[PDB]
Design a protein that fits this description.
heteropentamer, A alpha/beta (about 210), B mainly beta (about 230), C mainly alpha (about 60), D mainly beta (about 350), E mainly alpha (about 280), A: about 210 residues, alpha/beta, Rossmann fold, 6-stranded mixed beta sheet, 5 helices, 6 strands, elongated, D: about 350 residues, mainly beta, Methylamine Dehydrogenase, Chain H, 4-stranded antiparallel beta sheet, 2 helices, binds 11-(4-methylpiperazin-1-yl)-5H-dibenzo[b,e][1,4]diazepine, prenylation (chain C), G-protein beta-subunit binding (chain C), host-virus interaction (chain C), membrane (chain C), Guanine nucleotide-binding protein G(I)/G(S)/G(O) subunit gamma-2 (chain C)
Chain lengths: ~210, ~230, ~60, ~350, ~280
């Protein structure tokens, strides 16, 4: 070791010092992946080529990601959660939404990532079933035998959440679970819902490593 | 853009105290190791002290050890040299030198204007030539020798060349015996082995005159040659 | 409308350019690759391990 | 009619090339090379490991001096390593944490990175101020960058997820030439030694040879079954190797315009991430999803050795210009050098 | 009856081997598995190390002490064994207390505690538990005859030599065993309650695990820690045979510690299975 490479070694140490100190800063933030379609209204969920939005609830950092078939999904291997936004009003494109949700749930890279699922535009569904011009039983024949476990709206809402939950409960062996939600444009308690859901996601992994539940 | 502005100096009675300060504005001061180099009233070039980036390593010459203190203020982008119990031998122009240390770096690249202070087991590098008559357009070769082999076991030989034009601070020419400094014309070349080094200048012109200084960076204390002067005919 | 015709025309033109090119036999291609491999086998440190006196990663 | 006539012409052209390719397959490369002594067992050991990355390593590129390498990770950091002394030369922060590619200029004065931001960022390393500043932010691709390679200090070729490749003028910041013809996402990109041609591997299970100056495709290679993730020219420049998700490497010949050999084993099911050749082209090194790398005899399709030192996916793998070392980067945030 | 008491030595030797190997598979799994080199498993490392001293330094010397009915080692060499046993056993209690606090905060504060607690705040918890265990018995055993009075134990026997006073015995038992256990049973009860809330928001396995790891400190330590309390005011009313049985049960918790806290983790369990058969 000469004079210069000894000074070069000291420079490497300071670089390592900066590397570990800002890695801890990134360790305290939670990464979320926002997914949806054109009509989902996923931009107006949390009032705050890849778009990043940041919001803080009860002094914890949340860092959301927006991109916009999916070869890059392996990059989001270690995200805290996936936020999926679905337009419940659009009956025609619901079948497309379930196919996308099924594709994202059974992805080889996301077998252990929980999904927070938002039924956006719940008000449009309220003023569409009541009108009765369009019936969701046409696209899915089994709303015919509808039952709620306005009823016509509540059973309509519960049928849609069951379609998404059924895909989630089909496989996964309980490693990751879905958190259904119903939202609207005027709704403002959305970062709280992600906060409560992300808390349960972290709690369950802590429970698993303690071999408790 | 890169600038090192000196401050302090003046007439100091023997046994007094003084604090020279150099302000850096134009480059990343925190990532640069910094040196102090004096140059006696009318003599040569002598190294004084070194402070590493992050203030984690400090070196002193034996002459100034125990009575010189070097420090840096990273937020203020300045470094200081607190001098205590200074004597008549400390009267010199104190240059402040920036330096960086990584693979392929160019240490001692920039020098600042000095501060004139007036007080009322080492590698010896010999520059035998002291003054050579030079005609413009000719080829000039300057020789240098060291008491120890500068060729390290890692393949790097740690010898440096500097030019000090009259009235200007010294400028880096060659680092590690073979590498041209940035902004130095291609007519400068350096070669040699351990204990034997040569600086070759081809097609010499104006503004190429001054004193050429050798330097080792194989071992602290870092040491200079006496200096070879180039003059016209 | 006419987008399909334009795309189909481009496919044929690209196919025609690739369908008319100079080709050599696999045996000559196989031999040339083999000749290159044993012409530079001495200058391959990973093929023939080099003593530690020359390895910069020892 | 109309499109029917064009469709029939395309089908006849494809059949003609198949017959033309079959007319040159007189003898298989395996048959010709079943007379040479096997390389035996390749015993490569981990010599120097590089620490400092906190997230998965997605790319790594060697320097032309065979000593400096640059690695990209999901932590939004670019690190330049002195492999001989394991020292960290630079730590360049990134504006986007999502990076999938990393390039080191042949002159050593620039590095390139890109990813989900759809932007190729070029960083100048040999500047005043003693820092690393972005010098160019190339934009125009509508998909994520998968690979970028430097031609010189002014030209660069980028592979994107828009099924296209582009050639950029760095000083102007514009796309000098665009390359079209791929159907799926283009994932890999390798430059020929003479720099006048390059190959691209895409998700359409095909590879295409492009002319940089002409801007048009010359040869299209179709012998795979899944996405092509890796590609690399033979040192001669008349062949290249491709790695796919079907757990199979194939060596294609430019002049014969067809496949030569396949590198597959019954116990390998995982896909291939990165491939490269050795100095002489006799050894083909492929990284896999099963946490280790395989060393293939490029002339006999025999597993000469295994590089097993990683506990996660081996994402990137590279061979120095002088052939002394092999660098493997993995998802475990570690870089290993083998000799 | 050497033909019959030899079984006692064989049985204690077998569990002494079981105790030492259990810590070995724990200690090496921290090194052979990179996924286990986390801040949470640092506490599990200390527990095995503490039980390791019980396995070799402490337990075997007691096994000889019952068949060889005299302390063949020197009296100045007996305070070392008493101090080592009383510093490693306490360290086992304290590390269990630290684990229970770590688990309680990780469940009650999932989004804050883990990120806030770095490797620094962990090192101090591990170190502080040993330090309190370090200077809590060694002054009591080594510097009770040298500072007050003189040696009182017979040369053929060896006990901790301050059970006569019913003042420091109650104080040290409370501060060494009873206080840590009361904290753990309250903390683990709170963990069960919040586990139910998670289940209700969205019990068979939660109640089982929190009782198996809690009804192992009680069973293995309660009988001994009451006879020391009885022995305070009394002199020899408790039989010496029963004193030995309770003395040995206290060592058993070190054998059960590596499975109730480390082998619960799936990653630790997988590494143990690999190390048991696919030796590497
Ligand atoms: C098997 N040995 C027996 C001795 N030990 C302890 N004896 C005590 C002596 C007097 C009062 C209470 C205790 N209880 C302990 C509480 C914490 C740590 C150690 C003891 C260690 C285990």
């Amino acid at each position: 070791v000469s004079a210069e490479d000894k000074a070069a070694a000291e420079r490497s140490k300071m670089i390592d010092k900066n590397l570990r100190e800002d890695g801890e800063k990134a360790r305290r933030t939670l990464r979320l992946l926002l997914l949806g379609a054109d009509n989902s209204g996923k931009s107006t969920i949390v009032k705050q080529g890849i778009f990043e939005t940041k919001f803080q609830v009860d002094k914890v950092n949340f860092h959301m990601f927006d991109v916009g078939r999916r070869k890059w999904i392996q990059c989001f291997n270690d995200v805290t959660a996936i936020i999926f936004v679905v337009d419940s009003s659009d009956y025609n494109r619901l079948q497309e939404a379930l196919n996308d949700f099924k594709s994202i749930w059974n992805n080889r890279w996301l077998r252990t990532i929980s999904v927070i699922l938002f039924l956006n535009k719940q008000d449009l569904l309220a003023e569409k079933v009541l009108a009765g011009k369009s019936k969701i039983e046409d696209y899915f024949p089994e709303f015919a035998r509808y039952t709620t476990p306005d009823p016509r709206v509540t059973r309509a809402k519960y049928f849609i959440r069951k379609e998404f939950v059924d895909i989630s409960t089909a496989s996964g062996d309980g490693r990751h679970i879905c958190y259904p939600h119903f939202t609207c444009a005027v709704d403002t308690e959305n970062a709280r819902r992600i906060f409560n859901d992300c808390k349960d996601i972290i709690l369950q992994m802590n429970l698993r490593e303690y071999n408790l539940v | 853009d890169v600038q090192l502005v000196e401050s302090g100096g003046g007439l100091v009675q023997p046994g007094g105290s003084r604090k020279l300060s150099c302000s850096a504005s134009g480059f990343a001061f925190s990532s640069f190791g910094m040196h102090w180099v004096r140059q006696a009233p009318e003599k040569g070039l002598e190294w004084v002290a070194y402070i590493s980036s992050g203030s984690g390593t400090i070196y002193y010459a034996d002459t100034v050890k125990g009575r010189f203190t070097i420090s840096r203020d990273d937020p203020k982008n300045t470094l200081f040299l607190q001098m205590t119990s200074l004597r008549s031998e400390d009267t010199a122009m104190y240059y402040c030198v920036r330096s960086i240390y990584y693979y392929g770096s160019s240490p001692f690249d920039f020098w600042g204007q000095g501060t004139t202070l007036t007080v009322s087991s080492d590698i010896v590098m010999t520059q035998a030539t002291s003054s050579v008559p030079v005609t413009p357009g000719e080829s000039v070769s300057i020789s240098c020798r060291s008491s120890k082999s500068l060729l390290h076991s890692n393949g790097n030989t740690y010898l440096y060349w500097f030019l000090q034009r009259p009235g200007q601070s010294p400028q880096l020419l060659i680092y590690r015996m073979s590498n041209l400094a940035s902004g130095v014309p291609d007519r400068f070349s350096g070669s040699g082995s351990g204990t034997a080094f040569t600086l070759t200048i081809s097609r010499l012109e104006a503004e190429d005159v001054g004193v050429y200084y050798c330097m080792q960076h194989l071992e602290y204390p870092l040491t200079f040659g006496a200096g070879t002067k180039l003059e016209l005919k | 409308n006419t987008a399909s015709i334009a795309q189909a025309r481009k496919l044929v033109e690209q196919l025609k350019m690739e369908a008319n090119i100079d080709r050599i036999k696999v045996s000559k291609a196989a031999a040339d690759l083999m000749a290159y491999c044993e012409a530079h086998a001495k200058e391959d440190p990973l093929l023939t391990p080099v003593p530690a006196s020359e390895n910069p990663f020892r | 009619s109309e499109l029917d006539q064009l469709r029939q012409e395309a089908e006849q052209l494809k059949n003609q090339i198949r017959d033309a390719r079959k007319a040159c397959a007189d003898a298989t490369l395996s048959q010709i090379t079943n007379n040479i002594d096997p390389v035996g067992r390749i015993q490569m050991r981990t010599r120097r490991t590089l620490r400092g990355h906190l997230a998965k390593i997605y790319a790594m590129h060697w320097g032309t001096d065979s000593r400096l390498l640059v690695s990209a990770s999901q932590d939004g950091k670019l690190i330049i390593w002195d492999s001989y002394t394991t020292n960290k030369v630079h730590a360049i922060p990134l504006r986007s944490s999502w990076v999938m590619t990393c390039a080191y200029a042949p002159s050593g004065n620039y590095v390139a990175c890109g990813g989900l931001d759809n932007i190729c960022s070029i960083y100048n390393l040999k500047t005043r101020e003693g820092n690393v500043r972005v010098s160019r932010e190339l934009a125009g691709h509508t998909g994520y960058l998968s690979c970028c390679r430097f031609l010189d200090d002014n030209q660069i070729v980028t592979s994107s997820g828009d099924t296209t490749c582009a050639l950029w003028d760095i000083e102007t910041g514009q796309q000098t030439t665009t390359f079209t013809g791929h159907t799926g996402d283009v994932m890999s990109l390798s430059l020929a030694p003479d720099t006048r041609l390059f190959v691209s591997g895409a998700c359409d299970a095909s590879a295409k040879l492009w002319d940089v100056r002409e801007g048009m495709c010359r040869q299209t290679f179709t012998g795979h079954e899944s996405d092509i993730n890796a590609i690399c020219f033979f040192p001669n420049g008349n062949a290249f190797a491709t790695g796919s998700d079907d757990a199979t490497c194939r060596l294609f010949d430019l002049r014969a315009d067809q496949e030569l050999m396949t590198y597959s084993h019954d116990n390998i099911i995982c896909g291939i991430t990165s491939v490269s050749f050795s100095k002489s082209g006799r050894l083909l090194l492929a990284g896999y999803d099963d946490f280790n790398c395989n060393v293939w005899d490029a002339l006999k399709a025999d597993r000469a050795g295994v590089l097993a030192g990683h506990d996660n996916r081996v994402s990137c793998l590279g061979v120095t210009d002088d052939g002394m070392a092999v660098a493997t980067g993995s998802w475990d945030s570690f870089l290993k050098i083998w000799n | 009856t050497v033909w019959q008491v030899v079984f006692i030595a064989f049985l204690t030797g077998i569990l002494a081997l079981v105790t030492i190997i259990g810590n070995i598979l724990v200690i090496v799994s921290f090194k052979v598995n990179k996924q286990l080199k986390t801040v949470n498993n640092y506490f599990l490392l200390s527990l095995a190390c503490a039980d390791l001293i019980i396995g070799v330094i402490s337990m075997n010397l007691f096994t000889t002490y019952i068949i060889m009915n005299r302390w063949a080692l020197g009296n100045l060499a007996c305070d070392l064994w008493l101090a080592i046993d009383c510093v490693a056993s306490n360290a086992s209690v304290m590390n269990l207390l630290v684990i229970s606090f770590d688990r309680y905060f990780s469940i009650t504060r999932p989004l804050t505690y883990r990120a806030k607690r770095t490797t620094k705040r962990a090192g101090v918890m591990i170190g502080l538990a040993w330090v309190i265990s370090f200077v809590l018995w060694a002054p009591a055993i080594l510097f009770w005859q040298y500072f007050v009075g003189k040696r009182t134990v017979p040369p053929g026997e060896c006990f901790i030599q301050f059970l006569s006073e019913p003042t420091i015995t109650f104080g040290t038992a409370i501060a060494g065993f009873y206080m840590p256990v009361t904290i753990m049973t309250i903390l683990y009860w709170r963990i069960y309650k919040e586990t139910e809330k998670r289940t209700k928001e969205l019990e068979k396995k939660a109640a089982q695990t929190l009782s198996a790891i809690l009804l192992a400190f009680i069973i293995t330590w309660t009988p001994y820690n009451i006879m020391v309390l009885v022995n305070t005011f009394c002199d020899s009313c408790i039989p010496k045979t029963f004193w030995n049985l309770g003395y040995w049960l206290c060592y058993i918790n070190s054998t059960v510690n590596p499975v109730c806290y480390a082998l619960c983790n799936k990653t630790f369990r997988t590494t143990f299975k690999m190390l048991l058969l696919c030796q590497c």
